[PDB]
């Protein structure tokens, strides 16, 4: 009663000794609680007239306050730390106390004399009490405990302003509190928009107040958002602890996980999805970078858990649900968005290396944010989003660096397929200026990587391999965005992760098959050999490169005449790796062999779709140079091509586009054609040499 | 291009909807949204038929829709519900859809299944065959479902039951779209503005002034005229019942609560008056068709009373004394109706050739009472039982002016019962009913 005045919530077992005394009296308290509950259980208080309604309500809150007091005293004992007997008594008290509350409550609700607004205010009183108690218990730190070493004024802690003290009893109260909170917020929602101000509702069942006033009261009494998140973080962390214990009070992590999941759902639905301006305004104001960091931490913990489990999966999905809500909700400021991104490590303007592999929610959230940003710009025709253009350029560079080092990365250090997909999607949204700049940067990177052939010849190529898958896909599709990639991203990143053990990568038929064999037998934990241009149809070599891509390649920005060389020279990459590893009596591991197969396949397709350049046609017209191993491979390929006119045409028209004089083109092509036995003898002599 | 749309429509008209063509119509509507919302009456019929058929077919595949394509379905359904509520608010002569059918289409977009009959579906197909209209495609379609997935996430919370769950989501988000349009309110406006319901509500409101109950279908001629008005009244009562099955009255706030009680007591009085008219018909004197019509009317009358009662009872913004007072008013109306039907004779009717319970009281049983009379009577007995049980406990261990005929009217148990006793000699009415029923059963 004293507490109801000015919502001055307080608890007397703040001192461990005080809590101890409270514990001492647990036995008789249990008897009283049980006796009262039984009396209420039997036909009593049939007419809840205002007077009787109040009396009945008082008893409901009486046990309510006592129960939270017991939980608090226990937390105090724990921070300070028949023992089990006392714990049993305390648990019984809390449980029965909540049951008295619920009985009186159903009574009020269903009754014919005061069943509705009075139920709602009873629910406010209950939440208020529960929320205050939970907040106080969480705020109890052994330090403050010993400092005191009696009223636990929540206002004092707040005014003054580990989080220990949270336990099974805390979970119980939190769960019930969540229930009460949900109801009042649903009440808010049903009301049409902006119905209204007013004062904090009064702590009285009879007092008639607006649902908003009731919620306002709760918020004013205690910070709704802060308390919810505090409980959420503590519950999830405690659950993880129990999990670790099992790997090595209830020891069920699921319990805390359940509470945590419920909290996420409540906030997302009752608040995040709430269209009430007051609610949204409160949320935005309540939101803080600290909250973002906590959320990021939980995301990373879940993403880095590595254990799907059961309840964990549900919590994980709910976590993502909350994350995506935040990303889409305008309540999260751009500042808060960037804070969360940095805390995950996926900041789109950070320095250092771009995280090639991104965790399942850390990636999904990043993709959602960047795509919503690109849509905003596209909606108003704004210029290419600088953030996404910088992700692209820091990716291209973690990669130039990785390929320059030619160091085989681990699965956790390798670009994930879904990440590649969202990156291609972002590249599309970019205007000609942005996509052309990306293409030019790719050309420059490949040319620089070709500068040192010896290192490239002795490195494993998984990363020049991913750069060239990228460039290849860019070649085939550089204008229209493919339908599959859309579906792909939506299905992988922008869709509930429940707990579908599959991404969705057009894997390599030849490489993936070989990998599987020499790979884990259970399932393919990770796509490390995939494709992003689809198992396409074998179009005529000609017209593969996207017309616009062809135009860019021959523009001043791209020196194709010389990218042709870097591409031809690149073929030798990873050619001496086998010669090296055998000399060192080591065998090319499965990952290495698979990578080398992958690279030849990718560069072979690229050399084939890219039109032969002028210098190289001139070479085919002399044949004096060495025409090394791969050089002769390429040469034979193109000679076979030229034998066919379609290719003659294709190549000659590309030469006209290239900028080579048309008659020069004609002559070169003729000579290279070596119609009749001329070609026969030419083949002969090249292989002879 | 309007052609290909009527196209999947007719292809599905033949043998159910091809989910495959669905992602096409969703697209179509979501786009022509602005057109449907704001168009010329020249193509009103076309647009209206399009909307009706689209709603019906989307409801037919409600349980089976790709979870990814489910969001686009919800967007197209919000557009369709917008058109429907707009029409139900502003009745248009050029509209080719009846208000009953439009209310039923909203009901289906918001409920488990559609109810538009096939005869009416072929009528819509013909009004559409009127053609009175004003690869890359795959790409566009997926890009659009994209801008959808992205922008908004399903929050899909709350394989032979997965259908159940998809219907569930469809229903739920459609209900949300309504609430979104405040259609529930727009629809209360519609329920209070029905052609025959305007007059019935007027009379019942005139009665809440303790002007005696005064049923009107009573003169031999008035009963003939109302039997004439029987079929059309069924149409209105049915439409109102279909509308108020949705969350139309979800937020029972005093304000709205008043209108919610108004409509309920309105069918109560309409039904009691139809019963009194049938009583005059059997006392004073296609006929079977009209009899069935009036039976259906009284049945749905009691049903709507019960629905609004349970709504006020389980509401978090209404109930307790408010619910008790709704029960009190219903009981008053039913008892007064019983008295009027009981005390009418060939003699009185012929002499008349607007009954008043107080008129009969100042002047001061068998006949008139029939099967519809049995119904109103059983309901009145339920309500009286309730009020009297209240009075018991209230007078726990043995423990003002009559209760006003208003929902929020504040009164003691004794008072509600005193108003129900000052309106009809209660002992008398009850015992008379007992005797009459026993006799008729014999």
Numbering used by the authors:
A (entry chain A): 274 to 354, 366 to 433, 440 to 451, 465 to 499, 503 to 554, 640 to 890, 903 to 1092
B (entry chain B): 28 to 161, 182 to 205, 228 to 354, 366 to 433, 441 to 451, 465 to 499, 504 to 546
Pull verbatim passages from the article behind this deposition.
Purification of SIFI through its subunit KCMF1 led to a complementary map of the N-terminal half of UBR4 at an overall resolution of 3.4 Å. SIFI’s scaffold is primarily composed of α-helical armadillo repeats of UBR4 and relies on antiparallel dimer interfaces at its N- and C-terminal regions with buried surface areas of around 2,160 Å2 and 4,212 Å2, respectively. The N-terminal dimer interface is mediated by a domain-swapped helix from one protomer that bundles with three helices of the second, as well as two Arg residues that interlock the dimer through polar interactions.
Organisms accordingly deploy silencing factors, such as the E3 ubiquitin ligase silencing factor of the integrated stress response (SIFI), to terminate stress response signalling and ensure cellular homeostasis. After restoration of mitochondrial import, the E3 ligase SIFI marks HRI and its activator DELE1 for proteasomal degradation to terminate eIF2α phosphorylation and restart protein synthesis. Together, these proteins assemble into an approximately 1.3 MDa structure that is built around an open twisted-ring scaffold (292 Å × 229 Å) and two arms that extend to the side and span about 356 Å.
